[PDB]
Amino acid sequence: EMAKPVLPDLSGYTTEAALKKIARNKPGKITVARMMEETGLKEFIGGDNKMAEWVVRQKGIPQAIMISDGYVNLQDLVKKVPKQFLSEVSPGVYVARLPILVKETGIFEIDSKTKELRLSQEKGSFIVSEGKMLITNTSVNAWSETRNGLAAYRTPDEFRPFVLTWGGSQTWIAKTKMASMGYNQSKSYGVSISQYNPNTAKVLKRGEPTGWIIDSEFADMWYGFYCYETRDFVVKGNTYRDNIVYGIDPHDRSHGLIIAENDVYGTKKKHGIIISREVDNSFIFRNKSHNNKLSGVVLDRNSVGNIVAYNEIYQNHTDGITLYESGNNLLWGNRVIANRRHGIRVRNSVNIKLYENVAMANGLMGVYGHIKDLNDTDRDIELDPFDAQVSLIMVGGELSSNGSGPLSIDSPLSVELYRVSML
């Protein structure tokens, strides 16, 4: 009854296209100042009474490299900033020993000819941008000076460097390798695109943040990608390998995202790709999400009006796709294969359209739809409400070779099957 989904055009999201998105013609001011002077740093660290950890990492009054009023590349920072803070240990290889803050009117670029930028773990380095920032053909890694290598993951609360962008910012990362960034701490998950915290946005009224991340590799991250109230962000052609908790984790009222042609695998604790808490009107298509500790693809907490299409979802250790309390979504033409549990699982979600899906050789059911009362759990039902009904329309595709059977739908409000192949 329905026509193919109309999916965005990805042909324009190019390393070559990316490079022509910033104003290089006007330099370019560099200062090294106190972090607590700056909103972009206060906003996640908090008051002055939280500066202790940083005072310990820097062994002194906490400071940052700062870029504003113009354009500054990495090579520019190296020339102007003292060695002890920004050092070229070998041709094209730099160790930064202070965090880098790109202010609101700043424009910061790392192009090729930068072999690798090393963010020092011990000195508490990291990157925040409230302006324009472009990273192409290069490496930005979390670097342990003591180990003399990547800040390999050990435990959730051990700080590692990270990238974070604030409201009103634009960010483009292309053909770039990043590893070992992020840890269990607000705004510090790995690569994080964020609107400001509710109070501050009430004052700055900046637009929601945006940008692209294309053709890059992210490994050992705490979260591969995180975002909060982000608009129209593009994540295309990336590899997320061996990240800790999530591969890609768009969150909290983000919308119009394009998550496409990514290879996301080997996530050690939770899911490959997960959109949570009102991630609406977005597009998850032609990804390979495979071999994650939990599910391949997850739509969570009233994340609605989305399209999940033509994804290769296979060999995840629980479900292929799981929909948690997230109705009015379209799953078209996914190939969901050999996941240890269910092919596609719909919990507490209504008006799910499953068109042309293939679900084969999953450990349990091909498609499993159920309801669950969530009232005596650790769930904030004030913030994330739920209604315990399930209804889906299934059209075409195939359900075959699943361990427990083609489909099971417990206590549905309605299920309609038309033209579905079952073997």
Helix content: under 10%
Kindly state the number of beta strands: 40
**What count of domains describes the coordinates?**
1
CATH class: Mainly Beta
- Write the CATH fold name: Pectate Lyase C-like
Overall radius of gyration: 22 Å
- Strand percentage: 35-45%
- CATH-defined architecture: 3 Solenoid
Q: Name the shape in a single word.
A: elongated
Distance between the termini: 23 Å
How would a textbook summarize the main sheet? Answer: 26 strands, mixed
Family: Belongs to the D-mannuronate C5-epimerase family.
Keywords: Alginate biosynthesis, Isomerase, Periplasm, Repeat, Signal
Pathway: Glycan biosynthesis; alginate biosynthesis
Organism: Pseudomonas syringae pv. tomato (strain ATCC BAA-871 / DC3000)
Description of the structure:
Helix content is 8%, strand content 41%. The protein is built from 5 helices and 40 strands. It has one domain (1-423): Pectate Lyase C-like (3 Solenoid), CATH 2.160.20. It has a 26-stranded mixed beta sheet that branches. The active site is at residue 251. Keywords: Alginate biosynthesis, Isomerase, Periplasm, Repeat, Signal. PbH1 repeats lie at residues 230-252, 254-277, 279-301, 303-325, 326-348. It catalyses: [(1->4)-beta-D-mannuronosyl](n) = [alginate](n).
List the keywords:
26-stranded mixed β-sheet, 423 residues, 14-stranded mixed β-sheet, 40 strands, monomer, mainly beta, Pectate Lyase C-like
